[PDB]
Amino acid sequence: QLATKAARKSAPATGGVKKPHR
Amino acid sequence: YSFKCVNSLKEDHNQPLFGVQFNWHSKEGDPLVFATVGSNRVTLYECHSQGEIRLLQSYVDADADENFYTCAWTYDSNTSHPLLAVAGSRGIIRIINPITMQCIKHYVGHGNAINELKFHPRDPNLLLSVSKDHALRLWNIQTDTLVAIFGGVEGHRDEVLSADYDLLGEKIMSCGMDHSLKLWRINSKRMMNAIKESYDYNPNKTNRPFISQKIHFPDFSTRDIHRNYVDCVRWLGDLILSKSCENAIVCWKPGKMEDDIDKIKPSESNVTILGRFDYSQCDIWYMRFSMDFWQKMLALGNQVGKLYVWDLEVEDPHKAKCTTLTHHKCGAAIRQTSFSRDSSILIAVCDDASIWRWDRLR
Amino acid sequence: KRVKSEYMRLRQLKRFRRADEVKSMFSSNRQKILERTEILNQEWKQRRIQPVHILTSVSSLRGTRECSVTSDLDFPTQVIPLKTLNAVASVPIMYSWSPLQQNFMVEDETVLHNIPYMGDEVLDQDGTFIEELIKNYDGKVHGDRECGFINDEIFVELVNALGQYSDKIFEAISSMFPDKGTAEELKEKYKELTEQQLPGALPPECTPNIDGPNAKSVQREQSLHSFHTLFCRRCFKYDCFLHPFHATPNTYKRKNTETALDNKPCGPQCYQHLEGAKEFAAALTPPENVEWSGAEASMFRVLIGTYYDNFCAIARLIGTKTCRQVYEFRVKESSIIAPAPAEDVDTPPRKKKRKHRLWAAHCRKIQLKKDGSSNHVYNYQPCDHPRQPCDSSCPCVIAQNFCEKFCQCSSECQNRFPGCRCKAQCNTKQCPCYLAVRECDPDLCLTCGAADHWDSKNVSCKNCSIQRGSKKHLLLAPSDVAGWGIFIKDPVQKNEFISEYCGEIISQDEADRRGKVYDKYMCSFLFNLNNDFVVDATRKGNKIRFANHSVNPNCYAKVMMVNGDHRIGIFAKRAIQTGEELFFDYRYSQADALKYVGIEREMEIP
Amino acid sequence: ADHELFLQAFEKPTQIYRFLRTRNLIAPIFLHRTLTYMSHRNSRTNIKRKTFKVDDMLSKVEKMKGEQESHSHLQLTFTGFFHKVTLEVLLVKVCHKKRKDVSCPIRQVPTGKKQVPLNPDLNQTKPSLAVSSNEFEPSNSHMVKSYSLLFRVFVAQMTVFDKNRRLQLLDGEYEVAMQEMQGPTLQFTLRWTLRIFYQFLYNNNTRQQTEARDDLHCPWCTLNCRKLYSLLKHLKLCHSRFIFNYVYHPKGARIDVSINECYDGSYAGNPQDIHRQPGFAFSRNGPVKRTPITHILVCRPKRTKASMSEFLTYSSGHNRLYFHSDTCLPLRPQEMEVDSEDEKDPEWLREKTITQIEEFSDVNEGEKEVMKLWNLHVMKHGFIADNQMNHACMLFVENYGQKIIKKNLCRNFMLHLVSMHDFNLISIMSIDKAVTKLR
Amino acid sequence: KEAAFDDAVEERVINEEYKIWKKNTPFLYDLVMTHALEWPSLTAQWLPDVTRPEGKDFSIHRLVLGTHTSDEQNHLVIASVQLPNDDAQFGGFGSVSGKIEIEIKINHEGEVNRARYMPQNPCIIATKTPSSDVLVFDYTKHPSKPDPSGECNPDLRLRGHQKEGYGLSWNPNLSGHLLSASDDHTICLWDISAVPKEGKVVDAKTIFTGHTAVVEDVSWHLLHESLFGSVADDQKLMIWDTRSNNTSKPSHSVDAHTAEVNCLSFNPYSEFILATGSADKTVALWDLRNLKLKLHSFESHKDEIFQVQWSPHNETILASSGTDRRLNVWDLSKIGEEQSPEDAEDGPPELLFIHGGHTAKISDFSWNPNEPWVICSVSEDNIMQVWQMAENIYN
Amino acid sequence: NKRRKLKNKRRRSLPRPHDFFDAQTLDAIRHRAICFNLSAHIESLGKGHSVVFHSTVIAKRKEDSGKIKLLLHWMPEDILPDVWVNESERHQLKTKVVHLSKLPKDTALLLDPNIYRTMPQKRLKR
Amino acid sequence: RPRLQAQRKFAQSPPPATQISDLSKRKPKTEDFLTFLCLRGS
């Protein structure tokens, strides 16, 4: 079951780390 | 045990009524007076002999659309004037003085419609309000301060429907749509200290607001009595009476038959049913029953207009009695019944905005 | 089944005697009534009250409406002018709730237990919605299938009477009663009837308290069992309201040698200073029959596992015995004890780990594994590696998350996190934590002041407010858009912490059910936390729940990680002064955004 | 369709303005001749100098011309009274009302009386005379508003002087009548010794049509607007509770009118007074404190020219009423202060934790009590960092040191310390220190 | 009773009138400013100095104000105000932070009945109190932050009176000379020009006891240093020429109006013109030359009149304030000018303007220097207003 | 802004602002207006801006010469005073109509208490 | 059926566009409407 999906308040977020020093 | 229909009336706005309350504070010998609330009006009447009924006063609200639901008579200690209080769908509490024909106080704070109002049997300044907000509120109508709020983490969960005081005014029963029945105490030292403080508060003396008391946990609760809505409860000494849409009233007591009411621990988990009362065609909710002051008779309306009456004497509940007074005019529904301080007269209201009077003949 | 047939058979007697009893009850109750009512009446006899007068038409209104009542019987009709009432001001709708300052765990609910009521007109054509909700819960509602009632006493009587002639009876009882609904309870009652005995309040292996009279010598594990099984390390509390208790015990390695170990005279009855015990202490590396109480014996057993070599300290704690007596008792009792492991670690390498760019390399590996579909953030859980290293089978490694300090990963794990080092504020883009959104833990960043000033209320770090919880003062009042709203008291700059968004935490599917009812009324409080959990503020939370929606708001929400837990923070999008209302975008789907929230408050400026 | 709706919809506003009309004609708010679009009014100009030191001279000569003349006792005889007993005559002086007086003071002094015949008739005479000196005095010109004569037998009255001190009585034979408490009367003698149309809409459900008469006059307040531009401006600004449209019917003018939707008119005084209990609201009999606010409404008008084609304010401070978070009750200005009604430790949580702890059965009291005591103390302060723990325990026994000694449960406290040290938070250097500090 | 119902109806009628006025304001004023205080005030006075910052479109002015709290601490306050100082400028007109801010606060005992600054030194200010004395202060000697304890140095208070009063005036030409009038029916003159031993005790140099009723007002002469007038409830205006040595017999005494007199003032430019307002709802004027001729009467106020002030920068402009919740501005050059019937029904020609802002008794009002056509008004509703009348009315 | 577009601020359905006028006060105004109109007859005769009075003879005075002045008092008993009129002018001023702005100021308030009031009505301070 | 049915609360179940005089007609609808002619604009 669980076919339906309620509307939730969602705040996305993503992030890298760094580039090594050269 | 016999009543006869001597008088009946019908309103003009033809909107269903919901309230009847005889003024049980009348001194010995004064005329019998009562009131009834309809869609947006309140009406007063006085009972005369030979079945005569006289219209005294009326009030109406036109600022907004609302349905009045309930009322309660009281008096003023300062000057001993009759007092009335009303509420409706808008969640507004009004107090009216019929001597001056003017509203003297109004109270706000609830979020949804109000379902019932009752007063402390001993102290006239305490008012209990039951709302659809899952909360019960207690007001001191004299100092205009709010005393107690019932509800919260362990309160009701859906639209509390009714509440009742004990005969001595120190315990309360609450019932709602969630099949749950709960007990609440007032004797506790904390509660009485809170009331005493509420009687002493001057806004000009302190910058602080009055500190109301919050109560989250009941003294006892259960949900096993009924498998449907419960919308009326009544104390009977130490026993409890309740009804539902299951076409039957039930009387019971908490715990075992040996369990004293005052020794029940909060973690109690057993109940003892004692008896049932049978009727027919109660297939809707929001209908109420009533008892006389002397606690010797019981009356309840019916959907198709019939009446059901029992005695509260030693008559065993298995076959206590079966009394059914009937008339052929109206069969829409009967919401509430009312007695006087004595058992002289009984009053009922139909769903078609009509009033019916029955007069006792021993 | 004929279970009811037997129930009535006994009920004939049970109802008979019960009848008598209830009669004895009635006579008692009716007596008390007779007293109480009388008392009330007496008080009512002490009052005088004014009578009411008929309505008199005041000249103040020459023209007004009137009401008349028709009489069904033979009476005339009276007419009376109406009386108007003064107006009062209403307030928007609200529901009950309680204040909160953190998240709260909630177990899933499987039974409806209540049926909502609509306006009685919407469902007149769409009654199907009730059946669809029923199918969502699969038809389980409390009260339904009750088939009467059972007090568990008649059930026990029937079980005793229902002799072999257990399984079928239990199944029938479960089917006929939602209260039991299981044969496990039937077997529990069967066992209770067969045995009808209990060892006591303490567990089956009775463990009386040390401070009680019933002293009994027991080994260390049983004495500390409850403490080890009940404590939660993360919040430092017993029975945390936001942590499941499934975790390993405190049976972990530790530094075996952390004491001075300097021999000296402990006193007159000193364990050392005597050639017998003085040499015996090293060897184990005439006694007296003192009154070693069982509580004292268990105390010695527990305390041996704290020093293993200090008789002076142990005897100092255990006042009953003596240091020399303690050594003698160890020679008597401790001589038969089992040997200890005495393990430890060294961890020499410090040089190569300094560069630490390989940590960024492994971060890049983790990211590139599922970089494209990295939208699926996962809840943190401490990984356990008893023998194997933190390889690709590591629960944290597969989870695509770093290893917090609570993990069992080795002290030199490459999957751990190094921590911040910034100097001025750990708030700008250059900060490592600020990039991988986190809050500097007060055990790692010793530079930004996160560790410092834990008791005081002034720190340089701007990335540690949520832990310290310095929210701003907020006022409540009706909003200018819909219902209530929140207003700010004092001015605030852009990109500053405002407050958190607390509430109960539930599973995704569980939140789905509540969404169905929330949808019907077009009002909701459900906020998505991560890929597994959803936070609901309907029944608990704080003021922030009232914030309204706007397409060009002055605040924005951020999902952040703090000490392994997800949190939600609100920050300002521009400079805000006194008395303005707060908004942020709900990020709904455009169709649902228009369906639910179609108020902009402003027309097209151009 | 119950048209009583339409009527009832438009009945409420009209009367209001009607009342205001009668008020405005007598209680002006501002001169209509100063209005920018009413410039045809106020036909005069500001061009004038009028030095002051000559204005007196113009008056000094004028007072000479103003003094035309002045008056210079009285005697009157009463003829027989007539009807289809002694008489009474009184002199009443009315003075100006003062600050402490609620009404104009009056002083009735009798000058005398005479015995008149009881209902005499004409031709029977073959007489009483009243003579009045200068009872009034010049100084009274400062205190007395007026004088009057009163007659009784039966009441009658007359007045001697006008507002300008002009005597209203000449000499001659007068016949007058009197009332009691044609008919009774008496006699005596005295001797000094483009067509415009309107449409009313009701949301397209119904409408009414009328034609204006005496056009260019406001049908509500009767203001005379000489131009369609000024008329439209006045209607759109003053009577704001309606909404108007200009249609330009070829007959000269046609206006369609509808009811305003919002018209956000509400009490603008102290916002708190709306929720005061009746009897105290609008007390207006004592100073009251309230929050500061600042508005601006006029900065730099443009003063553009008239244009018929066109016819087809920030805040600072708190400007609303605030409510308590839990009880939804109004908030007093002083109650708004540093009290933030929010802290870390709710009481319901403190009760819930204890009741939940009591549920477990495999635990003796000696551990439940310690667990509750430690948990409550932890929630009191909210430790979050491991380094704090060394101090935490130190403070714990500092607060409950008396209770545990009273409870006789220090052994379980030591066991708790051992368990904590097992979890790597306490050091062996502090385990004994707690017990040493205990005693 | 019937009074409550009528008051209820009036409380709504007034609100409707105010709503109409606020809607119609824009085409009447060139400037409208409003600000709400916490406690009400009974004083109004513009300090003479003015500062104007370069590179901006506004000037800065300062205002003196009192406080009459219910039961709490009382304060004497001085605040700043930013008035637009441009013709093209039109945020509202300037910055977006704020245009009004308090800058000086001093503790006080009791409320403030009256307060005026000394022209010779704006720092020194006088103060009437509910007590039977007068206080003097110099805000430069005290911190802006009030002392939490309460009362502080009185700064050389005075003595001589027995009841509270309202009269207060400094001598424009002679420093130190000041006159006060109170319920004692007396007029007290001090000279604080030189008091080496202040000791917070200085007795009135002279006392005059001409009026028998309660004295209402007193004001020095605008050119002479030995002339002034006295006004009381006796409906008598008395001219007191000092240095005659007669505290009982004045130089002149006449009856002004048929009611008690409330306010009196002198024309700054002319030497002889005097203006007076009384409870009679009438405004009168006189000349020092001859006093037995009431020169003219203005009849528009519907209740008592409590304040009159001559306009600086203009020789023929005057203002009147009363309890009618209205303020009038009159013109003396248009006396008796013929006007059209509609102009007549609008009002008399000599009436120039009427303010319609305040919704209660106008407690106080004040002109200012450094600005030609602006006045500040204060009412008991904690309401302060600053406004400029539209230019097109004149020229 | 220094110079923004004309006033423009609207949405779909903003909250209703709870108008202040109640029916309780509206009925009082209705009754007052009805009684005043029946006592003034302005809408029928005064065109909404004039008040009417009806005169009646009071006293009959004869001058020493061939003149006879008669006193007149008007029915509404308004601020107007009684006036002497020559007998030759009789029957020409039986009823008078006057615009409202002309009426005496001091005694014009007698028509209605709501015409103007001092809201305190009892001043505690000066 | 019995366990699925919802619970019910209640039972089962002008030509003349005359002039502005309409204003004078609208307010005084009772108690002797004046002008004796507003009845035309009903």
Residue numbers in the entry:
A (entry chain I): 19 to 40
B (entry chain L): 80 to 441
C (entry chain C): 17 to 181, 220 to 339, 426 to 746
D (entry chain A): 81 to 152, 156 to 167, 182 to 223, 228 to 254, 295 to 322, 351 to 362, 426 to 544, 556 to 682
E (entry chain N): 4 to 93, 106 to 410
F (entry chain P): 170 to 295
G (entry chain B): 108 to 120, 138 to 166
From the study:
Polycomb repressive complex 2 (PRC2) trimethylates histone H3 on K27 (H3K27me3) leading to gene silencing that is essential for embryonic development and maintenance of cell identity. The interaction of PRC2 with substrate nucleosomes involves mainly two structural elements within the catalytic subunit EZH2, the bridge helix and the CXC domain. A central mechanism of PRC2 activation is the recognition of PRC2-trimethylated lysine peptides by its EED subunit, resulting in conformational changes within PRC2 that lead to the allosteric activation of the complex. We discovered that H3K4me3-containing and H3K36me3-containing nucleosomes inhibit PRC2 using two distinct mechanisms because of the differences in their positions along the histone H3 tail.
